[PDB]
Point group: D2
C-alpha cells in the first residue's frame, strides 16, 4: 500500500513550473498554443517550442516537442535552492526509483536537474537554475483578450489515490480540499506547496495519466473570450467542458483540447491557502455541487480521456486499468 | 394559411413592456423574483406584485398574480401615443379577433388598454398611458451583484412559424435574424420594433405557449453572479441552460426556471438593429453554431417545456400538438 | 435669437453615422486609430483611410483625410430613406443655408448626399445610400482587448446653446438630459434620434468646434485595457480625462487625444431612451456630480480645447469667442 | 543609522493579518465599514467591532475600537507556529524594544501574542493562535457588488526608508519592487513574506504614520461598483485617489477615506512573488509611470495625510517631521 517515508528530508518544492509535452505535429500544435491561445514564445527550433505565460520570468511554462506518440514527458517543479536538487535525488534514490541527473538540464533554459520515475509512474523533474527572461506582466501592448497569465497546476490520474496522497504529503504538499466518503477514504485531493489551492491534484482512474495542465487568466471575461474566439474559428468542438464554476477549488473554469487531445484547463479565481492551519475542505463524494456549483451536465470524456506519460527512456508508461 | 392583412394601419408599437404571469404561490414566487433575482417592487398587495427592472420608468415590467393554474395572462407592448390604442383595437377587430378595451386598464399603473386574443392564440395587450415611477438607473446603493437592468423581449412557441412571421411583419416588426432551410422555409424568427435584436421571437413547437421572458444585465459578470448565488442557495437545479453564447442574436445567456416552471432568460450583449436596411442574418437549420456558439450540449427541456397562456376570460388556451 | 422653423418637414434622421476628420500626417494618425485603437480598415489609399467599428455594417464610421489643417470636415447622419435626402436639402434651403448635393457622394462608399453649412456653422451631411460591408460582430478572432464596437455620438461646442437646442429640436432630436440653471436657461443638452442617450450634444463655449466623437465598448474592462495599452506604449500623456463615470448620461468614460489633438471619447453603459415620454433628466448647473459621479478632479483642457470645423469649401469656420 | 541585526533568529512571519484602528464614533464608522463597504462582522459589542473579508477564516482582519483620538493601535502579522511568538519576543528584546506579551491576547479571538514598539515607532503584533470562523468564500448569497475578499497589506510612512528597509529585510521580508535614485538610495520599498507583491511597504515622509491598509476585490468591476455606490450615497468626496493603475505593483487601485480620515486602499490584480530569486523591479524616482501608469494627476493629500499610530500605553507616537 503505502510508499515508505524516506529517512532523508524531502526536497523543498516551491511550485509547479512547467510541463514538457510531446505532440505529433509541431506546426499544428504551434497554431493552437500560439495563434489561438496566445502563449508567448521564449524560443523555438525545428523540433521544439518553448512557451511562457504573461507573468512568468523563468524560461518557460510549456515545452512542446515533436515525437511519434502524443504524451507527457515531464511534470517539472522548481525547488528552493541548488542544494534541493541534491535532496530530491537522494530522496528518490532511497525510495528505489529510477533517477537521472543532468547538470546541464533536460530542456533548454533549465540548469542542473534531476528527473525521476516516481512511485506512481510519473516523470517528475526537480530543478532550481533557469534562465530569466523578460517578465511581460506590464506589456499591455501584447495583452490579448484571452491572455493566459500564469501556469497554476497539474492534475494526475492514478488508480490509488490514498497511496498517492500519503506519498505527496511526505513530499511536503498540503491538502487544501479533498473528496472523501463516509468511510474516510480519499477519492481525490488538491495538493499545494505554493499559496493557491493546488500545484497538483490526484484524480482516481486508470493511470498513470496526465488529466490536465492549467493556466489562469486575470478575470472571468478573459475565459469567455477564449470560447468566443474558438467559436469564430470553428473549433468549438475542442471545447470539452465549461465554462462553469467548480465547487471543489471554487475556480471559474474551462477545459479545452489541443490537437493531440491533451487537456488544458484555463481558470480564474484562486483563494489563499498559505496559513499553516489553512482549513481543509472535505467534500462528500455524493455532493453534486462538488463538480459543478451550477449543476452543469456531466461530460463523460472528462472522466475517461487523459494523456499518456513517458518513462525516462521516452517510452509510454503502461496504463493500469 | 396566412392571416389576412387588414385595410386599417397597424398600431405603432414601440417595444415590449411587461408580462403578466399567474403563479400558484405568490410568496414562493416573491422569494424568487425579489429575494433571489433582485427585481424592484413598485407596489404589491395580497394577490399581486408589480416589479420593475433597474432602468425602467414605467410602472412595471412584470406583474405576478396569484391563480389556480400557472400561465401567462398577457404580453404587453407599449404603443406610441393614445391614438394608437384605438388603432390596435380597430386592427384586431378587422382580423376578427376578440378584443376587450378597458379605459382604466387591466393592471394597476396602466391606463387605457386593449387586450386581444391574437390570431395565434396569444393574449396581447396594447397601451400607451402608464404611471411613471422613480427610474433607479443611478441608485447604485440598490445595485446588486446580479442586477437585471431592463426587460428586453418575449419568446413565443407556435406551430406555424411562417404564418406567425407574416402576421408580425404586417404589424410592423422587422426580422433581425431568422433560421431557414434550403427550401427557404422559416423555422424561427427574431422580430423587433425597438433597436435591439428583438421584442419577440417565434419558436416552432406545440402552442400557443410562452417560451421565455428575458431581462438584460449590464455585463457578463452579472449573469455569472446569478449562477453563483443560486448555487449558494442550493437551487442550482433551477438553472436550465447556460451560461452560453447563442450564435443567433449573439447574446451571452442564461435560462432559469421560476417556482412554477416559467422560464426566465437573463442575457447581455445586444447589437444595434435600427437602420432601415439592417441586414437580416439567416442561419441554416443545420448550422450547430446557431444554437450555441461554444457547442454546449443540448438541453431537452428547453425544446419541450413552455408555459400555458390564458384567453381573455382567464382560461388556458388549448395547446395544439 | 432663434433659428426659424421651416414650413417643410424636417428630414427623418435615424442616427449619427460617421465623421470625416482632416489629419496632418496620415501615417501617424493611422498608427493611432488602427494600431493603437484597433479600428477596422474598410479601405484606404494614399490620402484617405476609411474605418469602421466592430458591429457596423455601413461603409465607415470615420474617414481620415490628409490635409494642411487638422479639422472636422463633416458630421454625417443617416436618414430614413432616399426621399429624406431631398427633404434635408429642402429644409436647409428654406433656412437660407448653403447646401451642396452630390448624387455620387462626398466620401467613398456613400451615395446621394447633401452637405450643408448649418445655422450654427457646422458641416452636416445627410445620406441614405451606403455600401454594406461585412459586419464583424461575431468575428471574435479579430476582437482586441480594447475593441471599439460602435460609433455613438458627436459633441459640438457652440456659443449659444439655447439657440442650438431649439434648432435641433425642430429637426426632430429629443432631449434625454440637459443642464439648466434656476432661471431655466439651458447650459448644455444631450439630444437623440436613436434610442441611446444621444446622437449629438451641445456644450457652451467658443465655436463652432467639434468637442469629441465617441465610440462604445461592450464592457468596462475594455476601456481599462485601452488605458493600460497606452501606458505600455508610453503615450499615457494622450489620455486626457478618465476613466470616470459621468453623472449626466451615466456613461463610464475615457477621453483620449489623437495625434492632431482631436478628442475621442470611448465609453460604455447606455440606457434606453426610446419611449415617447422618456423623462428628461435636468441637472442643476451647480450639482458637482453632473460632471463626475465620483468627484474626479476637473481637467481644464477639456473645457477649452476642441477641433476646428470646415466650411463646404474646405476652409476653417472662424471661431466665435 | 542601521538597526543592529540580532543574534537570535527572526520570527517566521507568514503574512499581514489584521489592523486595530481607533475611531472616534463607532456607529459612524460601523456605517462606513459594514453598510457601505460590506465587510462581515465576526462579532461586536458597545465599544469594538471585529470585521473580516469574504475569504478570511481567522477571527478578523480589522478591529474598530472607540477612542478619543483616531489612530492605529496595532499592525498584526501571523507567524508560523506558537514557538515563533517566543522568537518574536526574544528578537525585539535583543533590539532593546519595549515588548508586552499577553498569553490571552490583546484583541478578542486572538491567542498568545506579543506586541512591540518597533525600531521605527510602529506597534507591531505577532501571534499564531486565532479562533477560526466560517470562511465565506462560497457564500455567494452574501456577495455584494463591491465585495472585499481579502486583506493584503499595510503601507507605513517613515522618515528614513533605507533604515526601515534594512530592518525589515533582517526580519525576513523580501523586496519585490523599490524606487531608487541614480545614487542607489531607496525612496520606497514594497516588501513581502507571502507570495503577493507585499505585506507592507515603506513610504518616506513624516512618521511613524499609517498610510493605508489595503483589501483586494476579485475583479476590476468590483472596485468600480464601490465608486458608483459612494456617488449614489453622496459621499464621493471621500474618494481620494483613483481609480487607477499603479506602475509600481501593477495594482488597479482605489483609495478612499473613512469617517476619521484613515485611508483604505481597495485594489485588484496581484502577481506571484514566491520564487526565491523573484526579480526585484527597481523604478527610477523620476519615472512618472511608477505612480500612475495612466498618468492620472497627482493628489496632494495622498503625500501629506496619514494616520497617527499608538505606543503600547495607548498614546500617540510623536511624529518626526
Ligand atoms: Mn484543474
Ligand atoms: Mn431569448
Ligand atoms: Mn460624449
Ligand atoms: Mn497599497
Amino acid at each position: 500500500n503505502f510508499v515508505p517515508t524516506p529517512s532523508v528530508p524531502a526536497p523543498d518544492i516551491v511550485r509547479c513550473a512547467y510541463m514538457e509535452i510531446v505532440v505529433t505535429d509541431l506546426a499544428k500544435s504551434r497554431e493552437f498554443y500560439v495563434d489561438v491561445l496566445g502563449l508567448h514564445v521564449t524560443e523555438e527550433d525545428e523540433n521544439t517550442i518553448y512557451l511562457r505565460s504573461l507573468e512568468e520570468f523563468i524560461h518557460h511554462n510549456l515545452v512542446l516537442r515533436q515525437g511519434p506518440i502524443a504524451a507527457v514527458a515531464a511534470f517539472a517543479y522548481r525547488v528552493k535552492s541548488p542544494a534541493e536538487v541534491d535532496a530530491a535525488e537522494a530522496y528518490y534514490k532511497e525510495l528505489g526509483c529510477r533517477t537521472e541527473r543532468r547538470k546541464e538540464g533536460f530542456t533548454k533554459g533549465i540548469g542542473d536537474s534531476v528527473r525521476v520515475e516516481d512511485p506512481l509512474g510519473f516523470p517528475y523533474e526537480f530543478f532550481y537554475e533557469t534562465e530569466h527572461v523578460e517578465r511581460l506582466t506590464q506589456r499591455y501592448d501584447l495583452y490579448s483578450a484571452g491572455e493566459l497569465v500564469r501556469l497554476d497546476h497539474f492534475n494526475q490520474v492514478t488508480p490509488d489515490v490514498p497511496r498517492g496522497r500519503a506519498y505527496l504529503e511526505d513530499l511536503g504538499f498540503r491538502v487544501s480540499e479533498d473528496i472523501k466518503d463516509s468511510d474516510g477514504v480519499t477519492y481525490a485531493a488538491w495538493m499545494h506547496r505554493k499559496q493557491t489551492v493546488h500545484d497538483t491534484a490526484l484524480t482516481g482512474g486508470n493511470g498513470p495519466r496526465m488529466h490536465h495542465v492549467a493556466f489562469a487568466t486575470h478575470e472571468k471575461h478573459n475565459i469567455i473570450q477564449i470560447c468566443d474566439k474558438m467559436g469564430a474559428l470553428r473549433i468549438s468542438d475542442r471545447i470539452e467542458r465549461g465554462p462553469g464554476r467548480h465547487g471543489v477549488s471554487n475556480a471559474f473554469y474551462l477545459y479545452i483540447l489541443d490537437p493531440d487531445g491533451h487537456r488544458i484547463e484555463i481558470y480564474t479565481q484562486d483563494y489563499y491557502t498559505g496559513d499553516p492551519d489553512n482549513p481543509t475542505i472535505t467534500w462528500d463524494v455524493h455532493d453534486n455541487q462538488r463538480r459543478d456549483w451550477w449543476g452543469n451536465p456531466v461530460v463523460p470524456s472528462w472522466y475517461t480521456e487523459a494523456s499518456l506519460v513517458l518513462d525516462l527512456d521516452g517510452n509510454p508508461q503502461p496504463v493500469i486499468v
